[PDB]
Structures are given as structure tokens and as C-alpha cells.
């Protein structure tokens, strides 16, 4: 059902996507030691930050069209976070620019598949530099794990 060039293709920009959040965080921890995202969390809810629910990529309610609809708004609501996130700061601009256009390459390509199968269709504010900080290391793990589960799905609708 699911084309293997369409495989091939996730696989690169979900492993590029992954590369560029997994460069924020080693940034965020050895500068300033926001190394756990788990001791974030219950920051999470508080900024502002959702887990976009991927309930239709799940072995439990497993569905192509759901899981495809699930995984771009979860993409499209990581967009509008990371442009709140406003570079960070200065030295961490570059990479949250890069990790931005990647995660939109990744969602045009989501969309285009979604129109190809008949499947047609405010941010929280980051006051201050820990905001800002503890924001970045809560959006780049919950995007790398987010991407490996709809992924994982992905490949069971395979070619």
C-alpha cells in the first residue's frame, strides 16, 4: 500500500529530524545540564507543550488513515512550537533553523502521501531563557519519539 520509495524517503528525513534534535540536546546538557527530559516534564504541561496523540499508529487501534492524520498534526503543532521557541538563543539558532525546515520537509512529504491515497486533510510563550531551554529539550525527545513510533507503524502498511 505504502510505496517503498515513500519508506525510504520517511526513513531519511525522520533520521535527519532525529540528528538535528539529538544535536539541541547535547547542546542543552553539557552547556547547562538540562540532560533529563524526564525531570521536564510536569514543565511540559505547564509552558504549554502537548503530546500529540498517535493513538491510530498504536498495535491497539493500528490504522493507515488515522495514523497518517495523527502523525501530520502532530508534525504541524512541532512546527508552530519550534517557531516559538524563537532560535532558542543566539548560538542555538542554526540548529533550531535546520531542525525546522527538516521537520517541514517531513511534513509536506506526510501530506503529499495523505493526498495520493484519497486521505485528503496560539503557541505558548517562551518567556524567559529557561522557557526557552527547558522547552527545546521537551520538544526535540518528544519529536524523536514520536517520529520512531509512527515510523514503526508506517512500515507495517509496507509496499
Known sequence: ?????????????MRKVQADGT??????????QLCHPEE???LGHALGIPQPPLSSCSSQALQLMGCLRQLH???FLYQGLLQALAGISPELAPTLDTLQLDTTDFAINIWQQMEDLGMAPTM????????????GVLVASNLQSF???????LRHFAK
Open 1 to 13: 500500500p505504502l510505496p517503498q520509495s515513500f519508506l525510504l524517503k520517511c526513513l531519511e528525513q
Open 23 to 32: 544535536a539541541l540536546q547535547e547542546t542543552l546538557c553539557a552547556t547547562h
Open 40 to 42: 521536564l516534564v510536569l
Open 73 to 75: 498534526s502532530g508534525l
Open 124 to 135: 505558548p510563550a517562551f518567556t524567559s531563557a529557561f522557557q526557552r531551554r527547558a522547552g
Open 147 to 153: 517520529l520512531e513510533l509512527a515510523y514503526r507503524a
